[model samples]
Target: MIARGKFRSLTLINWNGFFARTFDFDELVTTLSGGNGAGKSTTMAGFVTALIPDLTLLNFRNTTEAGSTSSSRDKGLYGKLKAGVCYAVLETVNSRAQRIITGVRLQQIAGRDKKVDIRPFSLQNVPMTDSVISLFTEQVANKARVLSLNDLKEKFEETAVTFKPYHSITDYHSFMFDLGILPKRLRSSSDRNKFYKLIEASLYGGISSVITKSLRDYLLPENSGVRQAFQDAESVANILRKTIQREQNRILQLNQGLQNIAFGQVKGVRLVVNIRDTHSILLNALSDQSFSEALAMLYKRIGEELLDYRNYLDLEVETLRGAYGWMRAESSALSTGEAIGTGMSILLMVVQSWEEESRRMRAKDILPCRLLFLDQAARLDAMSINTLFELCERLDMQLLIAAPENISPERGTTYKLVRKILANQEYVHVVGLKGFG
Candidate 1:
């Protein structure tokens, strides 16, 4: 059987005003629904924070009117809470029933310097249950809250289960690669960069935001292989230029020698002449012999090489132009829904490429199940939604989408993110409104 990683659940503790909640996912699709100001985006952000962990890629505020300068866009993972340790734990199970838990532990530092310490961690072959996670919290009088960083570490050590924090994100990414949650980066940097940009595209609010103005950077970046092809062609053209120049000077010398030979043609050697075969006669003149078959063959070979080099440059230019034209057409032709669907397609291709590469490397421990996280996907029309769902099924990818509508695919589940206001305090609640078939 093919190894594939599927998300079981995502648990958020003291994150974005949520005290504690665990959101379960259907193997194929899970949808998040809520009214405006409810915690739909906030709940979706928990998944991004746990799985992706890249601050630049994090976006919870999906307001259409806000520009890049909007303060909401700049909000960190620990935006609301002034002081506390919040955590986002994601549990995934592979085809072999092997479990892996990936998480992010966020701690707000004290004093004037307001910085949230982000530590990403992964637990292999272990289940992160609500009871297991509750160990990290303690009862302080009536209410329970998370322990400090050091205290949490000490508490984690007390249990038989291992829970270690990673210092470098590369280390965490390596673990993700092993589990097939992410593809190996060293194999292809272009695919990796494109994958991140695709995620950025899906996280945007409207159709215009789904695709950038120039789709070149997302599809073909400045540093892609096309740029290298142009550079290589330029160098080859230089060599061709120099070779032609040297051949010109040699031709001039050969012409002078031929004129001298013509004057003595009546007395010395009778010669047949042409502009193309001048080099062969020159070689014969230097050797004190009439034009030979070998010298003529050598001249013809040089001409072939010059022609080949010139053709090589033209080939690369045509390839680049074709790629550029496709980019322009895709950017301008796609509607809002089509653009979102395109982003989904890009992600599917990226993951498939990774899956193939990993199999070639004999890395079968990782699963191939892919996760497509989409925010504000309700912007898509019914046809677009049907297309997106069909594509996901065909691609063998699991979909985690957030929108205001309380609807899900036939085989999926929809959870409602409700905000309850009690007295002066506001609490966010996530309740399962629909169950998976």
Candidate 2:
């Protein structure tokens, strides 16, 4: 069982005509499987769309086909909706058996249909019961029906229940993270970007056999702070000059004095030699003992003055070279499947370790839910699929995935959705297939 915080269920009402339906999640893995146009993707899409509600950004991921890579299609999520109010309620339970219910209310405008306004609400220490759901419904002749956008807002203010409503997604996302409804890794922008990149790769399926230059650049960039150590070393080299600048100049002045003494002896030396040029001059003027002696003294003095500075710069460079050399070798050897799988492994491992440490240290409410969502599983190959399951199992993560067919490690619940036609209208019915062998 997934410990502590976990998503228990998700409810949808008039969100594509589910009619106040609830989908229960398994502790380990929950797979939604069906044929094309069978509402399997819609069920999962509703959950993500409600939370993230930037329709254009989400429609790309949610409405995409199994093998499709591009999000270039202009298919909006509103194109599949009716012109009315729709709600998506997500329920989560903590280790202390405390239940939190969060909801998104979408208002689909008539005729406009291209856009839907979303309102997010949350109820702490309250389970979403029928009575609670009724508060948002319109009462007509003692029967509860759907409300209009204006009516829904009016009803929300009129209700006796003290549910919390968020005016912006910034507040909503923070609330979700605080309540452990979403993973803690998403709290940071870098991890969130990497997580989405992996999701895109897993869903749409296009990664090179070997890690390319672009891939390497994306994964580990210089601006991401890898170059900072070298900069610091360079800065340290300059700072060293502050301490040793007088000594270095003193040595150069000695070379200047030697040049003055050997000026008439070395007749061909037109341009004055700095300390750096002393070595070549020393080699060339070997037969001329007077110039050679002056050149050798110049070389020795300059090396002693710049010894620490050169050593430190070489130290930083050598260390970085060794580190990047290993990274290059690993990048060269990594396959597409291996890269994504290892990334998944690293993320889940961190989550698991974090939860363990949080528990050990008794950190207050820092525990995040161990739930991961995946769609278009058919785009993933058998190895990737197996790796995903293996990582989830080993790390004790709860996975909710949508696919066209059943997959391995069939220990969790699988819901098969099928379309039923009645009175020239089609409805999606879900059939539960739990514990396959």
Candidate 3:
């Protein structure tokens, strides 16, 4: 399950006391509905900046008003003049509810003297401006430490390797390690022995089994030097060898004959001839025969090859089956040994198994996050919006969707929005700018 963390409220203030505050929603699933210029995106941006601080300067620039020329030492009223304060409280459930308070105060201070006045009216009971500013600065610095994509990839790789022991080799963990490690190792080495070993071990168990299977199934007994030499007369020995050679040639010819018949090459040719000869008959019986009869006849003839091909195929298949069975038994036996090669094989298998298990376990928890954010959500297609709404419910994820004002309540949560605002109206607290012009 995904760990739950949620924000409660946000407040923004400008140097000239142009400020906006919104309760938005306190529920697990809430929508931040508004028109394009209603400061919805700006609100989100502010929250993101508050969550991550070093980017604040990137979000806003600092400068003094040109004409009034207030001393830089006296906080300027224009051009990023200590313009805002934001507070975010994140809640996490434990045996007891735990709250993490992050507050940011923006201000201009004299060089090398960062201290500033603290007022009691700010969000939370935090009154010390310097402390709030420091907290904001520290929070942003801490968020910068949040893992990057490459950092996440490394951590995932490490976790996969760690959890790999609980699963089998054929699981997702092994697949991930193979997916990550093979191309990386291939680029560095001209000696492909290790690369081939990794590929063959992961794919076909081992290269030796593949080689052994090919030799047994395709090579002639004499060519393989597997047949015993007889101490007969030279002429008899020669005749026997020739006879064996002839039988092998005849076998190959018969196999090709069976294949050609089954694949419809000969039958197709016959059907064309019959169609040409019975043109009149075909026309008369167009309804009964049509193109289907010809095709069916061809298939019937092709089907006759099944019996003839079965004999040769059975022999070939039996040889392959025996070879594979023995190979698996041998590999299994080898796995039980203490040799360096065997030990490495076992370790590789264990690593592969663990990776497979981790993927299955993590997939259930991670897939929901892959979904895109719900900005401009009203423009989404009905099917996509419905799916998003359903997923939010199922995953218990909060969605802060913004939409135009003309949007219908029946189409979305306009009724719910009104209800929520009304419920909070009595308890809702509103803070205004100190001196509004």
Global lDDT of each candidate: 0.56, 0.52, 0.29
Query: Of 2 and 3, which scores higher on lDDT?
Result: 2
Candidate numbers sorted by TM-score from highest down: 1, 2, 3
- Where model 2 places Cα greater than 4 Å from the true spot, the runs are 61-75, 128-144, 147-161, 185-343, 346-363, 378-386, 406-409, 435-437
Candidate whose lDDT is highest? 1
Clashes of 2: 0
Q: Give one digit per residue, the lDDT tens place, for model 1 in 80-143.
A: 4335678888877766666777888876777455556678876554544445366457888988
Where does candidate 3 have its weakest 10-residue lDDT segment? Answer: 264-273
- True-vs-predicted CA distance for residue 234, candidate 2, Å: 12
Q: How many pairs in model 3 have backbone atoms within 3 A of each other, for residues 3 or more apart or on separate chains, i.e. clashes?
A: 9
TM-score of each: 0.67, 0.60, 0.29
CA error at residue 143 for candidate 3, angstroms: 35
